[PDB]
Design an enzyme around this catalytic site. Structure first.
Site, PDB file in Angstrom:
ATOM      1  CG  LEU A   1      -1.833  -1.236   1.387  1.00  0.00           C
ATOM      2  CD1 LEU A   1      -2.540  -1.222   2.743  1.00  0.00           C
ATOM      3  CD2 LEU A   1      -2.850  -1.310   0.257  1.00  0.00           C
ATOM      4  CE  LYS A   2       3.935   0.208  -5.060  1.00  0.00           C
ATOM      5  NZ  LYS A   2       4.773  -0.996  -5.312  1.00  0.00           N
TER       6      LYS A   2
END
Ligand SMILES: CCCC[C@H]1CN(c2cccc(OC(F)(F)F)c2)C(=O)CN1Cc1cncn1Cc1ccc(C#N)c(F)c1
Ligand SMILES: CC(C)=CCC/C(C)=C/CC/C(C)=C/COP(=O)(O)OP(=O)(O)O
Ligand SMILES: O=S(=O)(O)C[C@H](O)CNC1CCCCC1
Ligand SMILES: O=S(=O)(O)C[C@H](O)CNC1CCCCC1
Ligand SMILES: O=S(=O)(O)C[C@H](O)CNC1CCCCC1
Ligand SMILES: [Zn+2]
Lengths: 316, 485
Positions: free
Chosen positions: A102-103
């Protein structure tokens, strides 16, 4: 299955607010039930300006589904500071986000705001975490920019010791040993050795740096990263090109090239010819430089035929 | 016209040499070389008069790309939730691509575009990535929304431009709330600071006539200090404690080099003393041309040294070339032509490697093996346009613009946040309006400079360097906000 928030005892006092983009919007997105429901209640939370634990939980649900949602990250940070939440626990959550892929720009900036507000008296643990985080992608641009910020911010506060700078150069050297073509690590070396305000500039350091650059070129003669660092180095310190020409000339056919060059090293190396041409210009031999640019344009670097012809014409 | 722009099919293709030193970079480079060169080997040379038998035809598949973009006006699948905070970009990528492809929207559809975007506009100033009851304003959707309104809007009561004009003071106040003392801007309340924000802000401020001295203070210094030893520009510079010095924070990248060159170029129009601080234009031009890939990788651009070629850098890197060229020309001029990148090879990359395989979804892509998307469709086509049409900034055109400017017409002056933050008097403010407007309209397509690889059916429309909208959109849009005609 999924339990709508309208049926949850903990949310019964809240009237959700629908998204308002008009009756027939362009680029509409077919949202999941879970995402629409969470945003419906986030709109109501943000409208009443509620700073609460249920709002904090809600923001985490939303950014897990859309990590680039800058509005919800902004709200989340204001929740953390308004409620005096543990920022160290939030950092562990950001470590988990990276593991779970998750970036976004928004997660990296959230991490920066956490470090700024925690303001650790010694950031060594965060430095070492960032180092390890490069394993799945050693060229992650956000990570390298964050590492620059971390050392710059905390060195302004006086909190980077000489031992810390020394082990950072050791780590940088190892990154370039494992992959000398990692241009991100070359950029980091430039910060550590040249551009950071605390770097040493002496006759010794200039000699050491030139040795490292030339050794790197002789190890990988076709490595563009090493050639660009050499040219930037000489230009930045106003150092003449001619005295170094002996180490460069073998690629146009202090550390010197291998007597038999390494295998798979076809000659000439185009950036070695650029060096030679610029050396001729340094000697005011414009016609000799023009002849090298002409060969770059027509023979050795033909993808840049027009640029090298431009440089040839400038010689007149 | 093409003596110095050789076709990829006319050059010997060879892998980047290993020097007998393997590394992860080289593993991925060689894999990408095999992937691109194999597709070129299966494709007929676009420059051939009659296309070869058994090979793929590389002609630009404009109708496939149009249908790829058509979903923007019905609905997007659930996977697009990752772009739910960037819906104005989905609009921009779509409507600018259709402009380049020469496809007109009907008025009802344009009115829907306008109405959707105006629901993203906050009364306190700026556009968000979605509805104003859901998202706060952000510099990047503010650029995308303003450019999309230039493409789809008009001067009538339903055309959106009137609403933008009424929002000028509030947008200016949003911009000033974003401003940092060192010359950077946050992209939104509590957001990140880099040259993407500066670029998006300066474009909008230029187009809407809301530039002031207080807005611009130190902005030139922040950008100049982003230039690296490689000649391109990093995301940001760090001010050490007006500051004693500024240091660039990462490596040169095509995306941030585009934003920096374009920001610097917009600032050169502004008549302030000793402003803008100079950049090294020669080094930036050198970095730009060195990012064009070898024949074995199809002549596309990479975004940074020792990474991979990617079609979207046709815009980010290719589109910066005319800006760097003009800055170099100005510096040579102050002390006292063949194409500067391979305009042919870049078109070949676009036609042969960056189009989705035929008979499929349409769209353009990063590389073979990658799915097409709206972002790569927009930026491949924008870069293709720069390659097809020789763009330059014309001093005689700027001079003609100065001669026709009417300083007695215009919208109400911005009220600065600080008392001494405005222009000194009307003579200076009107001189600034004239210069900024006249230079914004100074880009031309050079007579006789067109190169359309593969024949004239591949031709797309001409985009403008710096703004990246068609000149036929830029001129009536900026004329509206400056009250010129
Ligand atoms: C359809 C998906 C595209 C993803 C792409 C573009 N995208 C982005 C998103 C919103 C607005 C926006 O704005 C503007 F940039 F104007 F388009 C850009 C991303 O976030 C990451 N991208 C991945 C990338 C594909 N090819 C090269 N990259 C690298 C990259 C990284 C960061 C940015 C930014 N910023 C970028 F543009 C490209
Ligand atoms: C107007 C505006 C918003 C401009 C920004 C444009 C742009 C392309 C920015 C790139 C920024 C970035 C961190 C790239 C690295 O991504 P990566 O590692 O995935 O790609 P790479 O391998 O090609 O470097
Ligand atoms: O490739 S594109 O130019 O974008 C458009 C597609 O090829 C459409 N091909 C049709 C198939 C049936 C006969 C009429 C043409
Ligand atoms: O009057 S303005 O301030 O211009 C516009 C409203 O305040 C917007 N507030 C929204 C509430 C929900 C979260 C995202 C913003
Ligand atoms: O205008 S010219 O460059 O001389 C030639 C035309 O553009 C050729 N376009 C092709 C025609 C047949 C179908 C596929 C495209
Ligand atoms: Zn891309």
């Amino acid at each position: 299955t999924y339990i709508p928030m309208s049926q949850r005892r903990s949310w019964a006092d809240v009237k959700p607010i629908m998204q308002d983009d008009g009756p027939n919007p362009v680029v509409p997105i077919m949202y999941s039930e879970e995402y629409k429901d969470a945003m419906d209640y986030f709109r109501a939370i943000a409208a009443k300006e509620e700073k609460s634990e249920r709002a904090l939980e809600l923001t985490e649900i939303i950014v897990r589904m859309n990590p680039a949602h800058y509005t919800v990250w902004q709200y989340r940070f204001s929740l953390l500071t308004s409620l005096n939440k543990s920022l160290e626990d939030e950092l562990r959550l950001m470590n988990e986000f990276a593991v779970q892929n998750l970036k976004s720009y928004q997660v990296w900036h959230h991490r920066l705001l956490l470090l700024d507000r925690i303001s650790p008296q010694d950031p060594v643990s965060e430095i070492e975490y960032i180092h390890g985080s490069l394993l799945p992608d050693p060229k992650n641009y956000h990570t390298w920019a964050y590492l620059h910020w971390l050392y710059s911010h905390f060195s302004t506060l006086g909190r980077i010791s000489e031992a810390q700078w020394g082990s950072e150069l050791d780590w940088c050297n190892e990154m370039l040993r494992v992959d000398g073509r990692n241009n991100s690590a070359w950029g980091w070396r430039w910060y550590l050795r040249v551009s950071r305000p605390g770097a040493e500039t002496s006759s010794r350091s200039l000699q050491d740096e030139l040795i490292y650059i030339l050794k790197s070129i002789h190890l990988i003669p076709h490595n563009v990263s090493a050639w660009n660092y050499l040219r930037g180095f000489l230009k930045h310190f106003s150092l003449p090109l001619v005295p170094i020409l002996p180490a460069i000339l073998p690629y146009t056919a202090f550390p010197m090239p291998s007597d038999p060059l390494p295998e798979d090293t076809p000659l000439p190396v185009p950036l070695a010819l650029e060096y030679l041409a610029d050396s001729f210009i340094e000697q005011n031999r414009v016609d000799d430089a023009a002849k090298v640019f002409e060969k770059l344009s027509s023979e050795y670097d033909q993808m840049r035929a027009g640029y090298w012809e431009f440089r040839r014409r400038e010689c007149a | 016209a093409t003596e110095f722009t050789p076709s990829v099919y006319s050059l010997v293709s060879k892998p980047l040499p290993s020097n007998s030193r393997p590394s992860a970079t080289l593993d991925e480079q060689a894999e990408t070389e095999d992937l691109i060169s194999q597709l070129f080997d299966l494709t007929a040379d676009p420059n051939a008069l009659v296309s070869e038998h058994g090979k793929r035809y590389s002609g630009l598949r404009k109708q496939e790309h149009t249908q790829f973009l058509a979903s923007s006006f019905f609905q997007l699948p659930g996977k697009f939730v990752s772009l739910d905070a960037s819906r104005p970009w989905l609009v921009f990528w779509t409507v600018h691509s259709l402009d380049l492809l020469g496809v007109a929207l009907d008025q009802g559809t344009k009115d829907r575009v306008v109405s959707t975007l105006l629901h993203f506009l906050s009364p306190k100033g700026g556009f968000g990535g979605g509805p104003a009851n859901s998202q706060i304003p952000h510099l990047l959707p503010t650029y995308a929304s303003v450019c999309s309104l230039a493409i789809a809007g008009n001067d009538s009561s339903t055309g959106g431009w009137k609403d933008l004009a009424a929002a000028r003071q509030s947008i200016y106040e949003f911009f000033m709330r974003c401003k940092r003392p060192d010359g950077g801007f946050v992209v939104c309340e509590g957001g990140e600071v880099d040259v993407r924000g500066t670029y998006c802000l300066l474009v909008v401020a230029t187009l809407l006539d809301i530039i002031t001295p207080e807005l611009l203070h130190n902005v030139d210094k922040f950008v100049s200090a982003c230039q690296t030893y490689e000649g391109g520009f990093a995301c940001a510079s760090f001010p050490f404690p007006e500051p004693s010095c500024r240091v660039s924070m990462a490596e040169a990248h095509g995306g941030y080099t585009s934003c920096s060159l374009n920001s610097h170029f917009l600032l050169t129009s502004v008549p302030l003393p000793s402003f803008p601080l100079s950049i090294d234009a020669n080094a930036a031009l050198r970095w730009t041309v060195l990012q064009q890939g070898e024949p074995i990788e199809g002549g596309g651009f990479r975004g940074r040294t020792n990474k991979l070629v990617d079609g979207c850098y046709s815009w980010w890197v290719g589109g910066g070339a005319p800006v760097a060229e003009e800055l170099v020309r100005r510096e040579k001029s102050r002390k006292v032509i063949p194409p500067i990148f391979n305009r042919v090879a870049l078109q070949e990359f676009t036609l042969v490697a960056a189009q989705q395989d035929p008979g499929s979804t349409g769209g353009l892509r990063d590389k073979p093996g990658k799915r097409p998307d709206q972002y790569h469709t927009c930026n491949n086509l924008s870069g293709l346009s720069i390659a097809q049409h020789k763009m330059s900034h014309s001093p005689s055109t700027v001079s003609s613009n100065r001669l026709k400017f009417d300083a007695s017409k215009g919208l109400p002056a911005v009220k600065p946040v600080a008392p001494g933050g405005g222009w000194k008097n009307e003579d200076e403010r009107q001189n600034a309006r004239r210069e900024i407007w006249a230079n914004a309209l100074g880009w031309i397509e050079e007579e006789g400079g067109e190169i359309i690889v593969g024949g004239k059916d591949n031709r797309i429309n001409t985009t403008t360097p710096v703004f990246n909208i068609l000149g036929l959109r830029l001129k009536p849009f900026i004329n509206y906000f400056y009250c010129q005609e």
